[PDB]
Amino acid sequence: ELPPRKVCIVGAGVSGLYIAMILDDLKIPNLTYDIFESSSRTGGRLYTHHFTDAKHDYYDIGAMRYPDIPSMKRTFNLFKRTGMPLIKYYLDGENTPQLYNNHFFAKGVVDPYMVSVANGGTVPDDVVDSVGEKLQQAFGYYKEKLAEDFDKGFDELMLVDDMTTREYLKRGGPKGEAPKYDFFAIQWMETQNTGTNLFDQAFSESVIASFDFDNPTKPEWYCIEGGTSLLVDAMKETLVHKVQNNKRVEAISIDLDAPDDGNMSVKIGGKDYSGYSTVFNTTALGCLDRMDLRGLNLHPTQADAIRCLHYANSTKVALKFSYPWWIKDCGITCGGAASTDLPLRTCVYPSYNLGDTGEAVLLASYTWSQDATRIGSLVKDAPPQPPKEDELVELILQNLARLHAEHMTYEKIKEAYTGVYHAYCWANDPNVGGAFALFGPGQFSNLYPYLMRPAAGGKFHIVGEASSVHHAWIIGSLESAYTAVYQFLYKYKMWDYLRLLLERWQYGL
Amino acid sequence: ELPPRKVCIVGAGVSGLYIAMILDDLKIPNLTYDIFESSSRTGGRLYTHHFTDAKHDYYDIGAMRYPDIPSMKRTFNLFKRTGMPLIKYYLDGENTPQLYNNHFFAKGVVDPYMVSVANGGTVPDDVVDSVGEKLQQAFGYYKEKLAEDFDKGFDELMLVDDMTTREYLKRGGPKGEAPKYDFFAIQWMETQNTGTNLFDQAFSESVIASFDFDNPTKPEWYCIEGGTSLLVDAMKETLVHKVQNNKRVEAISIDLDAPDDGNMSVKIGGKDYSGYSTVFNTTALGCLDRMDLRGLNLHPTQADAIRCLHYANSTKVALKFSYPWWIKDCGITCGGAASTDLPLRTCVYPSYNLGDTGEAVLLASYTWSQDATRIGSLVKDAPPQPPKEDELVELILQNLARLHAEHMTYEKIKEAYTGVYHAYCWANDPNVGGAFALFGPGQFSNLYPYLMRPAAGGKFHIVGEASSVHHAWIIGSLESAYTAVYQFLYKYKMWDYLRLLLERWQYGL
Ligand SMILES: Cc1cc2nc3c(=O)[nH]c(=O)nc-3n(C[C@H](O)[C@H](O)[C@H](O)COP(=O)(O)OP(=O)(O)OC[C@H]3O[C@@H](n4cnc5c(N)ncnc54)[C@H](O)[C@@H]3O)c2cc1C
Ligand SMILES: Cc1cc2nc3c(=O)[nH]c(=O)nc-3n(C[C@H](O)[C@H](O)[C@H](O)COP(=O)(O)OP(=O)(O)OC[C@H]3O[C@@H](n4cnc5c(N)ncnc54)[C@H](O)[C@@H]3O)c2cc1C
Ligand SMILES: N[C@@H](Cc1ccccc1)C(=O)O
Ligand SMILES: N[C@@H](Cc1ccccc1)C(=O)O
């Protein structure tokens, strides 16, 4: 018979909720848990904003789209477990505009943006129209290895993890046998492939992001109709022990002189909470670094990983319009997205309101990295009516006009704007401190192993999307939580329940 | 006589104020200007926060310290010209603690922080105690060349500008004849030299920053007694045409189908302001990228520079204490700064209140890059009292207690805290979008020439610290503003006043 044990789950995001769901499912005798959530809200970076309760009057501030690829199977099993209403998401739509250097894209014209050297720009002629082909040549070997077996593909990719994307492109790979590209060719590839400056981060991350967004299997994509927050509601409902919101952990400790299993504690608001056999920290690493972790005696390089593993910013801006003018007036009837070098960078047409004829939401700006930091600096809490008086609104409307200048005027977009919008910059969220992990050069191969290293005698686990090989996806959160529960059961020699974990949760539900 | 001409200065920071002061000094007949400032406040990144009107009850949110090195002569000339009350600033002080891996620094001790391989860390034994010496070996050649002639030293430095600092350290320089360092040695060097992740930006910037802070001439440092904003006040008082605050330029344009000199215009809140013969934009580049610049027909790589040139974040947190416990209880009597791997990173002891025995300000946290983004996520406008409930206040007090554990307790520091503090995160300022330019690899040698390329027939100038080789210093702003005025006078062949510019303003005041 198992002695009474209590574990602590720090953070009620999808990873912390997944840990509780797994523990609830295994039904281990005399085992309990507490879930402390710093925010008054539960879900973390699963966060649907509802403008009203109307059916499609929302947008997802955090996670929103899911590729049906084999490496994401655990995410889709969680969708099945909780009965999520999945519908098709259109990564690529029809008639979506692309606007660079104030020129619209056109198929089969050489250098439509007028950025090539032959047209007075600095992009080499043989690169300007061949970005996808040359990034495929740079990423494609590793992408196919990842498609056969993600873990073994990752281990081979780690042999070049010391390089940034720019570095790999500049030197022609690790030994100069790949093509070498000058600064402006690499710069154009970054402009056409990702957010500003992100090619100065890890090459391995550019490969994995390309694996996820441009997967060799050419997958179907999905969204959750009604918002991703429906997943949080369903996970919360099943909890045996409910989330305790407004409980921000500021310190974590283990008492190595105590003989007991439950010799760990966390401090919340100056008060001590002890008796825990294991602590799962599921917060973003910036939040973990603010805690007093001295009582845990972390390996010095593990502490370095908490502080230094790189995070990228992301900002989203969603506007409500009286009718879907992008559908009706521009023929953008199947989702997709418009991309531009204008400040909004990416305008995402929702896949969930394509049949609606009245009020409709447009995810008017979705940015990463410096683009998101620049948009996020306009994201305040008490903006002013009218639109022109709000700098962010006016910027978005002007960028939308230029981006859709083939069919709309600024005047008619402005008149369709209801005056209702919402924006969010994840780096300004004190409960995250960033959007998601996006490691720099050498971090996966050098710092990440020490982040995942056993701490406090195998009783402390750093959990979350950053503690995964799938950054910035729900799947990384779920894998990290599953792995941590494995280690917990292994640590306490609960062989019956570890075997049950592998039987029920390795491939599924 | 000269025909009447009008120029427009976008931005009332030190760049735009310097332009107006130069034009005021040259007294060019029938030449006028308008200065438009987006903010209700004038000064930009010269920004003193005054807790009260008491003599020393302030801290500088932006610029605060100035090294008396030859490359900084134009800044001190500006100080001299405006009668600034300069006092000595102590970059290094007495008894300043250094805290890494929860260990304090101790001279003459091997690996006092317990981070080397010999003590269970990952920092190479030959690196852990030699960061200053190995970085000097990596930067010193170029630092000495910059000391002889900054411009010629910069041009030689550009021959390795394709490399990041980490890349230069990893590969042993451009051809592998310098020492090669593994990831953890480079990581420790970054931890001990700059802010988190900044070794993943340009090697040239790490060299220039080392040249500024650790100059071979080993210079005296100075600050402005009463706050740097006294410089803004003095420059404002001299202006012939006063700053127009709350005037945010959203578009800049030139009418090439108009024969007049004054064929340029700017839009402010929908209304046009035309008749300008030249426009000086002095704003940060993120601010410029949000403007509609189509009417200027910028070179596409110049527009890329505006979007992509990298900015670093920075955040400051200052706390008021009933008495300077760092002076009286810790022997920290001569300014300096305490450095740590804790969230606050750097605690600066002011040099302007060393004789005070009552209320004193402490610049408790001064951070850059990801450190500043994480601290800045706690910077809100209406936080709660008491300190325990403001997460930022509590974090700072806790970090301060650990940093000064050799002489203070958390309880004594907390009781000395008045409850009055201020914080500021420059990336959250919509009038800047960042702290200052910190270019990535290859950006100085590739993007920066196009940023500085003549535009709109020589009538548009991108001015400011980012538009110089001295990023994040007043000197960069002054040099850029001086160079733009030169090119304006050259463009209109005002040879008499160009000669007067060189006579009075080249090494002038
Ligand atoms: C803009 C954006 C878009 C995304 N889009 C997608 C997408 O399309 N598809 C996809 O699969 N993934 C997407 N993701 C990724 C996905 O949202 C995340 O990977 C995942 O939700 C993170 O889960 P987590 O539990 O690991 O972290 P979190 O969600 O951050 O959970 C951690 C929790 O801990 C709490 N916490 C923090 N500090 C403390 C403390 N001191 N004490 C207690 N609790 C604390 C936080 O409030 C939070 O609730 C996106 C992420 C972002 C930022
Ligand atoms: C945290 C920090 C510390 C620093 N410390 C030092 C130091 O110790 N020593 C030193 O020498 N330097 C220091 N600097 C650097 C120095 O402060 C700057 O280099 C300099 O002040 C910038 O001057 P600027 O005029 O080029 O830019 P800014 O100061 O940014 O001036 C631009 C102005 O334009 C305005 N503007 C923006 N958008 C618009 C628009 N659309 N229309 C009109 N106006 C607009 C802005 O509000 C601003 O007032 C520091 C900088 C920072 C961020
Ligand atoms: N998965 C998220 C976040 C992400 C950003 C960039 C690269 C990879 C993932 C998205 O679909 O946008
Ligand atoms: N001038 C700023 C930032 C800076 C750091 C390093 C080099 C250049 C500028 C400071 O005093 O810290």
PDB file of all heavy atoms in Angstrom, chain B residues 158-179:
ATOM      1  N   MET B 158      35.434  46.657 -39.685  1.00  0.00           N
ATOM      2  CA  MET B 158      34.387  46.203 -40.594  1.00  0.00           C
ATOM      3  C   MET B 158      34.783  44.949 -41.360  1.00  0.00           C
ATOM      4  O   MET B 158      33.902  44.226 -41.839  1.00  0.00           O
ATOM      5  CB  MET B 158      34.022  47.321 -41.570  1.00  0.00           C
ATOM      6  CG  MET B 158      33.181  48.432 -40.954  1.00  0.00           C
ATOM      7  SD  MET B 158      31.654  47.830 -40.203  1.00  0.00           S
ATOM      8  CE  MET B 158      32.098  47.762 -38.466  1.00  0.00           C
ATOM      9  N   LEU B 159      36.082  44.666 -41.474  1.00  0.00           N
ATOM     10  CA  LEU B 159      36.538  43.492 -42.206  1.00  0.00           C
ATOM     11  C   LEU B 159      36.218  42.183 -41.494  1.00  0.00           C
ATOM     12  O   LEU B 159      36.424  41.116 -42.081  1.00  0.00           O
ATOM     13  CB  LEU B 159      38.042  43.602 -42.464  1.00  0.00           C
ATOM     14  CG  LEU B 159      38.445  44.844 -43.265  1.00  0.00           C
ATOM     15  CD1 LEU B 159      39.922  44.818 -43.620  1.00  0.00           C
ATOM     16  CD2 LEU B 159      37.591  44.969 -44.519  1.00  0.00           C
ATOM     17  N   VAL B 160      35.725  42.234 -40.255  1.00  0.00           N
ATOM     18  CA  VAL B 160      35.233  41.061 -39.545  1.00  0.00           C
ATOM     19  C   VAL B 160      33.792  41.239 -39.083  1.00  0.00           C
ATOM     20  O   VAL B 160      33.310  40.464 -38.256  1.00  0.00           O
ATOM     21  CB  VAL B 160      36.144  40.701 -38.353  1.00  0.00           C
ATOM     22  CG1 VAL B 160      37.531  40.304 -38.840  1.00  0.00           C
ATOM     23  CG2 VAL B 160      36.220  41.859 -37.369  1.00  0.00           C
ATOM     24  N   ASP B 161      33.086  42.241 -39.612  1.00  0.00           N
ATOM     25  CA  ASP B 161      31.747  42.568 -39.133  1.00  0.00           C
ATOM     26  C   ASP B 161      30.708  41.507 -39.483  1.00  0.00           C
ATOM     27  O   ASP B 161      29.608  41.533 -38.921  1.00  0.00           O
ATOM     28  CB  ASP B 161      31.323  43.933 -39.684  1.00  0.00           C
ATOM     29  CG  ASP B 161      29.921  44.327 -39.256  1.00  0.00           C
ATOM     30  OD1 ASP B 161      29.706  44.543 -38.043  1.00  0.00           O
ATOM     31  OD2 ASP B 161      29.035  44.413 -40.134  1.00  0.00           O
ATOM     32  N   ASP B 162      31.024  40.568 -40.376  1.00  0.00           N
ATOM     33  CA  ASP B 162      30.089  39.484 -40.659  1.00  0.00           C
ATOM     34  C   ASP B 162      29.903  38.552 -39.469  1.00  0.00           C
ATOM     35  O   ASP B 162      28.943  37.774 -39.451  1.00  0.00           O
ATOM     36  CB  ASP B 162      30.563  38.676 -41.868  1.00  0.00           C
ATOM     37  CG  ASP B 162      31.840  37.907 -41.589  1.00  0.00           C
ATOM     38  OD1 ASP B 162      32.915  38.540 -41.525  1.00  0.00           O
ATOM     39  OD2 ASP B 162      31.769  36.670 -41.426  1.00  0.00           O
ATOM     40  N   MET B 163      30.785  38.614 -38.477  1.00  0.00           N
ATOM     41  CA  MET B 163      30.784  37.670 -37.370  1.00  0.00           C
ATOM     42  C   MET B 163      30.085  38.255 -36.150  1.00  0.00           C
ATOM     43  O   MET B 163      30.191  39.454 -35.873  1.00  0.00           O
ATOM     44  CB  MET B 163      32.213  37.277 -36.990  1.00  0.00           C
ATOM     45  CG  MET B 163      33.045  36.739 -38.138  1.00  0.00           C
ATOM     46  SD  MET B 163      34.652  36.139 -37.579  1.00  0.00           S
ATOM     47  CE  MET B 163      34.199  34.539 -36.923  1.00  0.00           C
ATOM     48  N   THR B 164      29.370  37.399 -35.426  1.00  0.00           N
ATOM     49  CA  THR B 164      28.943  37.727 -34.077  1.00  0.00           C
ATOM     50  C   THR B 164      30.119  37.564 -33.118  1.00  0.00           C
ATOM     51  O   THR B 164      31.163  37.007 -33.465  1.00  0.00           O
ATOM     52  CB  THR B 164      27.782  36.835 -33.635  1.00  0.00           C
ATOM     53  OG1 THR B 164      28.254  35.498 -33.438  1.00  0.00           O
ATOM     54  CG2 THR B 164      26.678  36.821 -34.678  1.00  0.00           C
ATOM     55  N   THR B 165      29.943  38.059 -31.891  1.00  0.00           N
ATOM     56  CA  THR B 165      30.978  37.872 -30.878  1.00  0.00           C
ATOM     57  C   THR B 165      31.191  36.392 -30.588  1.00  0.00           C
ATOM     58  O   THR B 165      32.332  35.917 -30.531  1.00  0.00           O
ATOM     59  CB  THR B 165      30.613  38.623 -29.597  1.00  0.00           C
ATOM     60  OG1 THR B 165      30.161  39.941 -29.926  1.00  0.00           O
ATOM     61  CG2 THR B 165      31.827  38.722 -28.679  1.00  0.00           C
ATOM     62  N   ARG B 166      30.097  35.645 -30.411  1.00  0.00           N
ATOM     63  CA  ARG B 166      30.198  34.206 -30.184  1.00  0.00           C
ATOM     64  C   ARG B 166      30.893  33.510 -31.349  1.00  0.00           C
ATOM     65  O   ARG B 166      31.733  32.626 -31.145  1.00  0.00           O
ATOM     66  CB  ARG B 166      28.804  33.617 -29.960  1.00  0.00           C
ATOM     67  CG  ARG B 166      28.732  32.099 -30.046  1.00  0.00           C
ATOM     68  CD  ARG B 166      27.336  31.590 -29.699  1.00  0.00           C
ATOM     69  NE  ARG B 166      26.889  32.062 -28.390  1.00  0.00           N
ATOM     70  CZ  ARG B 166      27.270  31.532 -27.232  1.00  0.00           C
ATOM     71  NH1 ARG B 166      28.105  30.502 -27.212  1.00  0.00           N
ATOM     72  NH2 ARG B 166      26.814  32.030 -26.091  1.00  0.00           N
ATOM     73  N   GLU B 167      30.553  33.900 -32.578  1.00  0.00           N
ATOM     74  CA  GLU B 167      31.184  33.312 -33.754  1.00  0.00           C
ATOM     75  C   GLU B 167      32.684  33.584 -33.765  1.00  0.00           C
ATOM     76  O   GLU B 167      33.490  32.684 -34.030  1.00  0.00           O
ATOM     77  CB  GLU B 167      30.523  33.867 -35.014  1.00  0.00           C
ATOM     78  CG  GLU B 167      30.760  33.074 -36.277  1.00  0.00           C
ATOM     79  CD  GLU B 167      30.093  33.722 -37.473  1.00  0.00           C
ATOM     80  OE1 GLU B 167      29.055  34.395 -37.282  1.00  0.00           O
ATOM     81  OE2 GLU B 167      30.608  33.566 -38.598  1.00  0.00           O
ATOM     82  N   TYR B 168      33.074  34.830 -33.480  1.00  0.00           N
ATOM     83  CA  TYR B 168      34.489  35.184 -33.431  1.00  0.00           C
ATOM     84  C   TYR B 168      35.220  34.383 -32.364  1.00  0.00           C
ATOM     85  O   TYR B 168      36.360  33.950 -32.570  1.00  0.00           O
ATOM     86  CB  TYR B 168      34.635  36.685 -33.173  1.00  0.00           C
ATOM     87  CG  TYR B 168      36.015  37.241 -33.446  1.00  0.00           C
ATOM     88  CD1 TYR B 168      36.281  37.936 -34.616  1.00  0.00           C
ATOM     89  CD2 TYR B 168      37.046  37.082 -32.528  1.00  0.00           C
ATOM     90  CE1 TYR B 168      37.536  38.450 -34.871  1.00  0.00           C
ATOM     91  CE2 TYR B 168      38.307  37.594 -32.774  1.00  0.00           C
ATOM     92  CZ  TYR B 168      38.545  38.277 -33.947  1.00  0.00           C
ATOM     93  OH  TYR B 168      39.796  38.790 -34.201  1.00  0.00           O
ATOM     94  N   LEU B 169      34.578  34.176 -31.215  1.00  0.00           N
ATOM     95  CA  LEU B 169      35.211  33.423 -30.140  1.00  0.00           C
ATOM     96  C   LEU B 169      35.237  31.933 -30.450  1.00  0.00           C
ATOM     97  O   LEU B 169      36.189  31.234 -30.083  1.00  0.00           O
ATOM     98  CB  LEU B 169      34.483  33.690 -28.826  1.00  0.00           C
ATOM     99  CG  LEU B 169      34.582  35.133 -28.336  1.00  0.00           C
ATOM    100  CD1 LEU B 169      33.604  35.387 -27.200  1.00  0.00           C
ATOM    101  CD2 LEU B 169      36.009  35.445 -27.911  1.00  0.00           C
ATOM    102  N   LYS B 170      34.202  31.429 -31.127  1.00  0.00           N
ATOM    103  CA  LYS B 170      34.129  30.000 -31.412  1.00  0.00           C
ATOM    104  C   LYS B 170      35.177  29.582 -32.435  1.00  0.00           C
ATOM    105  O   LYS B 170      35.822  28.539 -32.280  1.00  0.00           O
ATOM    106  CB  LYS B 170      32.727  29.633 -31.904  1.00  0.00           C
ATOM    107  CG  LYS B 170      32.642  28.265 -32.572  1.00  0.00           C
ATOM    108  CD  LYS B 170      31.241  27.976 -33.097  1.00  0.00           C
ATOM    109  CE  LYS B 170      30.866  28.921 -34.230  1.00  0.00           C
ATOM    110  NZ  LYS B 170      29.599  28.518 -34.901  1.00  0.00           N
ATOM    111  N   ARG B 171      35.368  30.386 -33.479  1.00  0.00           N
ATOM    112  CA  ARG B 171      36.216  30.015 -34.602  1.00  0.00           C
ATOM    113  C   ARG B 171      37.642  30.531 -34.480  1.00  0.00           C
ATOM    114  O   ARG B 171      38.456  30.264 -35.369  1.00  0.00           O
ATOM    115  CB  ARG B 171      35.599  30.521 -35.909  1.00  0.00           C
ATOM    116  CG  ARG B 171      34.234  29.930 -36.178  1.00  0.00           C
ATOM    117  CD  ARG B 171      33.733  30.212 -37.580  1.00  0.00           C
ATOM    118  NE  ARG B 171      32.372  29.708 -37.730  1.00  0.00           N
ATOM    119  CZ  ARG B 171      32.075  28.460 -38.076  1.00  0.00           C
ATOM    120  NH1 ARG B 171      33.045  27.589 -38.320  1.00  0.00           N
ATOM    121  NH2 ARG B 171      30.808  28.082 -38.179  1.00  0.00           N
ATOM    122  N   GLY B 172      37.969  31.249 -33.412  1.00  0.00           N
ATOM    123  CA  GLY B 172      39.288  31.837 -33.302  1.00  0.00           C
ATOM    124  C   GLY B 172      39.508  32.925 -34.332  1.00  0.00           C
ATOM    125  O   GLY B 172      40.548  32.969 -34.995  1.00  0.00           O
ATOM    126  N   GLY B 173      38.524  33.806 -34.482  1.00  0.00           N
ATOM    127  CA  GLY B 173      38.637  34.916 -35.393  1.00  0.00           C
ATOM    128  C   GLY B 173      38.358  34.531 -36.831  1.00  0.00           C
ATOM    129  O   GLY B 173      37.844  33.447 -37.127  1.00  0.00           O
ATOM    130  N   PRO B 174      38.717  35.422 -37.760  1.00  0.00           N
ATOM    131  CA  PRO B 174      38.302  35.240 -39.161  1.00  0.00           C
ATOM    132  C   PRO B 174      38.976  34.079 -39.876  1.00  0.00           C
ATOM    133  O   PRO B 174      38.419  33.586 -40.865  1.00  0.00           O
ATOM    134  CB  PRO B 174      38.674  36.581 -39.808  1.00  0.00           C
ATOM    135  CG  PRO B 174      39.789  37.106 -38.952  1.00  0.00           C
ATOM    136  CD  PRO B 174      39.441  36.688 -37.554  1.00  0.00           C
ATOM    137  N   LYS B 175      40.152  33.625 -39.431  1.00  0.00           N
ATOM    138  CA  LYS B 175      40.822  32.511 -40.095  1.00  0.00           C
ATOM    139  C   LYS B 175      41.341  31.473 -39.105  1.00  0.00           C
ATOM    140  O   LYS B 175      42.200  30.661 -39.463  1.00  0.00           O
ATOM    141  CB  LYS B 175      41.965  33.012 -40.983  1.00  0.00           C
ATOM    142  CG  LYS B 175      43.037  33.797 -40.251  1.00  0.00           C
ATOM    143  CD  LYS B 175      44.084  34.325 -41.219  1.00  0.00           C
ATOM    144  CE  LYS B 175      45.046  35.277 -40.527  1.00  0.00           C
ATOM    145  NZ  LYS B 175      46.097  35.778 -41.459  1.00  0.00           N
ATOM    146  N   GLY B 176      40.839  31.478 -37.872  1.00  0.00           N
ATOM    147  CA  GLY B 176      41.172  30.434 -36.925  1.00  0.00           C
ATOM    148  C   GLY B 176      42.536  30.534 -36.287  1.00  0.00           C
ATOM    149  O   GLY B 176      43.008  29.548 -35.711  1.00  0.00           O
ATOM    150  N   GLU B 177      43.191  31.689 -36.364  1.00  0.00           N
ATOM    151  CA  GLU B 177      44.501  31.866 -35.755  1.00  0.00           C
ATOM    152  C   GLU B 177      44.432  32.505 -34.375  1.00  0.00           C
ATOM    153  O   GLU B 177      45.466  32.637 -33.713  1.00  0.00           O
ATOM    154  CB  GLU B 177      45.404  32.685 -36.686  1.00  0.00           C
ATOM    155  CG  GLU B 177      45.470  32.091 -38.088  1.00  0.00           C
ATOM    156  CD  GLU B 177      46.568  32.686 -38.947  1.00  0.00           C
ATOM    157  OE1 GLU B 177      47.470  33.345 -38.392  1.00  0.00           O
ATOM    158  OE2 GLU B 177      46.526  32.491 -40.182  1.00  0.00           O
ATOM    159  N   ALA B 178      43.245  32.889 -33.925  1.00  0.00           N
ATOM    160  CA  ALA B 178      43.009  33.282 -32.545  1.00  0.00           C
ATOM    161  C   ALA B 178      42.571  32.068 -31.740  1.00  0.00           C
ATOM    162  O   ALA B 178      42.273  31.011 -32.301  1.00  0.00           O
ATOM    163  CB  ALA B 178      41.963  34.395 -32.502  1.00  0.00           C
ATOM    164  N   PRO B 179      42.545  32.165 -30.409  1.00  0.00           N
ATOM    165  CA  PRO B 179      42.077  31.025 -29.608  1.00  0.00           C
ATOM    166  C   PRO B 179      40.619  30.694 -29.893  1.00  0.00           C
ATOM    167  O   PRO B 179      39.794  31.579 -30.133  1.00  0.00           O
ATOM    168  CB  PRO B 179      42.272  31.499 -28.162  1.00  0.00           C
ATOM    169  CG  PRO B 179      43.313  32.548 -28.242  1.00  0.00           C
ATOM    170  CD  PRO B 179      43.126  33.225 -29.563  1.00  0.00           C
TER     171      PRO B 179
END
